[PDB]
Design a protein around this nucleic acid. Sequence first.
DNA 1: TTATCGAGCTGTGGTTGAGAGTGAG
DNA 2: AACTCACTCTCAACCACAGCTCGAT
Lengths: 80, 85, 45
Amino acid sequence: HQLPLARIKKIMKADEDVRMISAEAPVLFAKACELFILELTIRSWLHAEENKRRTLQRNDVAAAIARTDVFDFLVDIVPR
Amino acid sequence: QDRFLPIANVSRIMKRSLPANAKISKEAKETVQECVSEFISFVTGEASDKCQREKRKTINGDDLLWAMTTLGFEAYVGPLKSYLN
Amino acid sequence: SMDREARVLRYREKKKARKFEKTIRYETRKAYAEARPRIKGRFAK
DNA sequence: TTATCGAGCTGTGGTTGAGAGTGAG
DNA sequence: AACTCACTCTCAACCACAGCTCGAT
């Protein structure tokens, strides 16, 4: 529908531990990415809105990442 | 980078996620592209571990939902289950 | 939490080990695929 | 408690058009 | 600065099936 399953599968298979992947796993993953992209984008938007801006900027995404515990794993990705 | 989800697909999804008047910097698109790509890695490693412990070779949909639950993403699990049917 | 920190650290260390080159893991399945009838690239009987 | 085994399932890869990537306006 | 949209050309999806996978037993 939206995200290409092959590229989802390719990221999965970059982990040397994964062996087989079920047919529905990338299907599920593509939906989960849409829920993830939505939440990360809206929380970034919030910060942009709070700073009286309409253009989401990188620091907005960083703000969302710092503030949201679920996004704790990405904290070292923002800064270069 | 060819290790990430395509940025056009990612950008489209952030756009539909926002009020029509919103704008998104090129930098913000690249940052979110990486993040959702890392989301797939993060979850896959936990699913991959579950399969090792339980000595199976196939990562299936339940393994992904277990992994998402123990990594803080229980809120997704409901909608996901409902989406498979 | 203490449990999250373990999984997050493991995720970061697994990072250095991502292998994106096309690795083949069922070398038999290559054989059958490599020598299999194709209509326009697609498999066929 | 651990093991079994057949109904189901999945990796594999040439080809190509659907759609990702691109940039001047 | 980001968005538009027509254009280029990449690359994801498609297929069959031998025999491995895994939960009801």
